[PDB]
Design a protein around this ligand. Sequence first.
Ligand code: HEM
Ligand SMILES: COc1ccccc1O
Length: 403
Amino acid sequence: ERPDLAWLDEVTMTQLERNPYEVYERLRAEAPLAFVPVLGSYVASTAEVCREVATSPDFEAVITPAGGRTFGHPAIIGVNGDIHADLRSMVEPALQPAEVDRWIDDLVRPIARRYLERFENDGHAELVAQYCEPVSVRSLGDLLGLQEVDSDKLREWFAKLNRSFTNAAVDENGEFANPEGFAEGDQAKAEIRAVVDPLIDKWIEHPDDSAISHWLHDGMPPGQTRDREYIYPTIYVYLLGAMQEPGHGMASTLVGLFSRPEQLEEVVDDPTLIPRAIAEGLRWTSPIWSATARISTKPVTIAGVDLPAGTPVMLSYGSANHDTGKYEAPSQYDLHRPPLPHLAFGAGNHACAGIYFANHVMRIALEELFEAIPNLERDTREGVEFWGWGFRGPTSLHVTWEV
Ligand code: HEM
Ligand SMILES: COc1ccccc1O
C-alpha cells in the first residue's frame, strides 16, 4: 500500500534466498522499515532500526510465521515474561564464559583434529561438508548429550529445519505459498523425537552432565523435571541455528579471507588474528541473516512509520551489517576494518545466549585448520555460492593445497 515502494510487489522469495543484498540496499535507502509483500511482514533493514526494535520497551519477541509453524511453543526465541526468564535460566549455565573456558578447548580441539585427520593429506576438500559443519554439530551435540547422533544426521536435521523455518513466502491472500515446505521440518521433528525421547526418559531418572539433562533438572524441586513438551521447542532452536551457525560463520570467514589473500596469509602466520577475522566474517555475511522478529505491544512510530500495536517486524541483521551509515564498502571483506559494533548476535533481552561459546568453537576450528594446512588455497576452478535469506552461508567451499 506504500506507493513509492510498489517495486517490492515484484520481489520474490527465490531472489531473496539467492541474494538479498540488492533489494536490501534499496530498502536501507528508501524505507528502513518496510512492508515486504512476499514475506508478509514489515522488515527492519538498517542498523539503527534493527537495534531500536530489538531493544525497545514497546516491542517484545515474536516468532516469525514459518518459524512458529516449525517450532511451536514455547520456543525461546518466541516467548517473553516469566516463560522466557525460565528458558534463559535453563540454557545459560553451560554458556557462561567462566564455564565455557573450563572445557571448550578439550571439547572442540580433539573434534577438529578428528575431522581434519580424514582429509588433511588429500590435497583437496569441500570444507563445508568435510569440516565446518561436522565440527560445529559434533561440538554442540556432545555438549547437549547427543554423542550417539552421528554428525551426518545432525547436519540433515539442521538443513531440513532451516528450510521449514524459512519457508516464509506468502501469496496474494497472505497465506503460506508453499505449505508443502513444512513437511520436511515435521519429518525432522518426528525423527528427533524418536531419538531424543529415550534419552530424556534416561536423564529424568539418571541425570548426567549433558546440557539437556541439566535443562530437565536445573532449578527444579526435588524429584521434578521440566516437562519434555516444554523444552522440545528450545531443543529445536538448538538443532537449527546453534548447530548450523558456527559452521556458517567459520565458512563465511574463510571465503572472506580467501577473497583477500594477503589477509589470509596474515592470519595463517599470526593466528591471534583469528577472532578479528571471524568478527569481520560475521558482519560480512551474517549467519543469522533475518530469522528473528519482534512485535509491537503498543502503537509506536519507527522510522516514520506509525505502527499499530500487534505489528511484527522482522530483524534483517544481515542487512544491518551492511549499513553504509556505519561501514565503508560493506560488501568487501576486510580484516583491518576497525572493531566496531555489529548485529550478527542481535541485541536486547533476546540477543544470542551462546556468543562466547560460538566464538570459541569457530576460533579453535580455524586454528586447527590453519595449523594442519598452512598452505590452504581456494580451488578457483569452483564457484562459491551463498544461499539463504533467513540463515545465510556458503553452500560449498572447495579448497586445494600442495601435498
Ligand atoms: C556464529 C554463530 C551464531 C550466531 C551468528 C548466532 C546469532 C544469533 C542471533 C542473531 C540470534 C537472534 C537474536 C535476536 O533476535 O536479537 C540468536 C539467538 C540465540 N542464540 Fe545464537 N548465534 C550463533 C550461535 C549460537 C550457539 C552455538 C548457541 C547455543 C549454544 C546459540 C544460542 C542462541 C539462543 C538460545 C538464542 C535465543 C535467545 C533468546 O531469544 O533469548 N547461539 N543467535
Ligand atoms: C540459535 O538458534 C536459532 C536462533 C534464531 C532463530 C532460530 C534458531 O534456531
